[PDB]
């Protein structure tokens, strides 16, 4: 059984996995305690493998884990380990820390990182694996392993290039962002599943799987929905094994039935078990069948519309979501959801009226406004993004959101706007077919990240009013925010508009952040500025960091020409 996992996983994977496992239960033990602990679990394998008859070899991985996981001095999680396996493990899990109290982990300099990676790969990689593992205790372990394999690639690559920095940083950054967001999205689903129970979750998956498997029949999709709700429900408890076994089963089931489900699953279904549920979760949408009729027959024109909906509301609604979603891989899931919500309200509002048909005859008209809203929203922003680069786009946003909610802290406005902008480059590349769904994905997390940051630090009425809305209305609410005309200018503070040669040496990314930080501060001190005015200043400012930083004498350039710039900007504003 543990021999099953070892020959299946192959030393490296098993070891990487076990390390992660301990790191997420024992969040506070030093790396070196875990290293030998993995070892005292490995090298029992590869022998416990040769000898199948050996002692404790057949006991459950939970047993073998939890008994290992009770060897070491330090400790009210103590009450644990008194229980005799399941009827126990709800223990350890129940005490895990939402977010633990340990060093906000700072990234080393490039030189250093590549040094430690060439001087020894195993230790530097496993070290960093343990480390990330412990701050992210609910992070599905295999996904973390896949990132570790992506990390090695990026290090292997950039440590042998002209630009070690221009190469690696962007990758670490892009990896970090995917990780964090992968994690945030796990939490999101889990929390949402608690706040809104299964029903909303199912609606979501129905929409999602239908877009992805448009040839599948309702019963196939519904089946997948049920199984997936199960998987997330178990995975949301926090146990790798229960979670993994369900994932691997669901994946096996999809593959057995791939011919029916999707022509896009050939590769995924021939991958090792470790990777198969992973490859599935990100397969491309299949092509929809060629001649899908209108949804009018079954959902508007039919005489039986109300008989049918009354007989099993949620399924009728699911079938509508299904038929809509598979026909519209262009829509975001939340849009499809808005559409079904509307449909639902309408059936409610009139399957009890004198002439049912009379009301609902026109229901699809109610979808245009809703489709149109995000559609237009994407056009203008991607347009706007297209006029300016990622950088200048970020700045447009910095200005937009600081004007909308100036009460928000600069660091947060900068991070969100930077991310919102990042979202633009990731999504506008794609055509008007693929854009909305790409936006939703990246947007929800960026938005929640803001919300979380806002939860534990309330500052604005309108923002929390947005963060405690339905996931379906979250973004619409955010999009309804007006410029805050009531907001009074922050006071000047020179230190905030003074710079030093030090900026010329920063990461480009870190340089931008410094400029963007000043931009927000600028809007906060002159909330009335026109963005015609801001241009002028932004333009004087870029020319300022160009003149200095290319000048022999930098401290003086930045200093007395900082004066030139400020007075020039203080005049021309206010």
């Amino acid at each position: 059984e543990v021999a099953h996992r070892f020959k299946d996983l192959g030393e490296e994977n098993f070891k990487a996995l076990v390390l992660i496992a301990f790191a997420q239960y024992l969040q506070q033990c030093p790396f070196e305690d875990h290293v030998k602990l993995v070892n005292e679990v490995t090298e029992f394998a590869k022998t416990c493998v040769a000898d199948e008859s050996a002692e404790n070899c057949d006991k459950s991985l939970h047993t073998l884990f939890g008994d290992k996981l009770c060897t070491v001095a330090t400790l009210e999680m103590a009450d644990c380990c008194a229980k005799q396996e399941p009827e126990r493990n709800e223990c350890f899990l129940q005490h895990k820390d939402d977010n633990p109290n340990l060093p906000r982990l700072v990234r080393p300099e490039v030189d250093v990182m590549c040094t430690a990676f060439h001087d020894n790969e195993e230790t530097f990689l496993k070290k960093y694996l343990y480390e990330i593992a412990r701050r992210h205790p609910y992070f599905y372990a295999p996904e973390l392993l896949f990132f570790a394999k992506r990390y090695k690639a990026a290090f292997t690559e950039c440590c042998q290039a002209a630009d070690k920095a221009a190469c690696l940083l962007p990758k670490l950054d892009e990896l970090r962002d995917e990780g964090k967001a992968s994690s945030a999205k796990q939490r999101l689903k889990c929390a949402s599943l608690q706040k809104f129970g299964e029903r909303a979750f199912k609606a979501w998956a129905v929409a999602r799987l239908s877009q992805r498997f448009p040839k599948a029949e309702f019963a196939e999709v519904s089946k997948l929905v049920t199984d997936l709700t199960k998987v997330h429900t178990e995975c949301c408890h926090g146990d790798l094994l229960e979670c993994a076994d369900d994932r691997a089963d669901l994946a096996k089931y999809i593959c057995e039935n791939q011919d029916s489900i999707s022509s896009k699953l050939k590769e995924c279904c021939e991958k090792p078990l470790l990777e198969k549920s992973h490859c599935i979760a990100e397969v491309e949408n299949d092509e929809m069948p060629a001649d899908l009729p209108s949804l009018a027959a079954d959902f508007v024109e039919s005489k039986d519309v109300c008989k049918n909906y009354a007989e099993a509301k949620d399924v009728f609604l699911g079938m509508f979501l299904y038929e809509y979603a598979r026909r519209h891989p262009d829509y975001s899931v939340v849009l499809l959801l808005r559409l079904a919500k509307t449909y639902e309200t309408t059936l409610e509002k009139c399957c009890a009226a004198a002439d049912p048909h009379e009301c609902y005859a026109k229901v699809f008209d109610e979808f245009k406004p809703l489709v149109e809203e995000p559609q237009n929203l994407i056009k203008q922003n991607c347009e706007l993004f297209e006029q300016l680069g990622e950088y200048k786009f970020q700045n447009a946003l910095l200005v937009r959101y600081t004007k909308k909610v100036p009460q928000v802290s600069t660091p947060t406005l900068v991070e969100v706007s930077r991310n919102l902008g990042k979202v633009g480059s990731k999504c506008c590349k794609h055509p008007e077919a693929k854009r909305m769904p790409c936006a939703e994905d990246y947007l929800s997390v960026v938005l929640n990240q803001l919300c979380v940051l806002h939860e534990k630090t309330p500052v604005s009425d309108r923002v929390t009013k947005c963060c405690t809305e339905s996931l379906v209305n979250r973004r619409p609410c955010f999009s309804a925010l007006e410029v805050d005309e009531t907001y009074v200018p922050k006071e000047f503070n020179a230190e905030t508009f003074t710079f030093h040669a030090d900026i010329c040496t920063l990461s480009e990314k870190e340089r931008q952040i410094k400029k963007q930080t000043a931009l927000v501060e600028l809007v906060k001190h002159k909330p009335k500025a026109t963005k015609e005015q801001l241009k002028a200043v932004m333009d004087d400012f870029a020319a300022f960091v160009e003149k200095c930083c290319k000048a022999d004498d930098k401290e003086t350039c930045f200093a007395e020409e900082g004066k030139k710039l400020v007075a020039a900007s203080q005049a021309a504003l206010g």
Binding site: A219, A312, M319
Partner: protein, 55 residues
């Protein structure tokens, strides 16, 4: 001549449709949907789903 697999699937569908009929589903719309299922498991997941929604 049916495979055992094809036999089981056909059965599960008749079974599930009767079982829905006995709960008060009357609509071809649902029975059709049961009928488009490809797997016994699909048959029973959707039957289950139709029952939960009937409340």
């Amino acid at each position: 001549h049916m495979t055992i697999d094809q036999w089981l699937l056909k059965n599960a569908k008749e079974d599930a449709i009767a079982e829905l009929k006995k709960a008060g589903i009357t609509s071809d719309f649902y029975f059709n949907a049961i009928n488009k299922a490809k797997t016994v498991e699909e048959v029973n997941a959707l039957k289950n789903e139709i029952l939960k929604a009937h409340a």
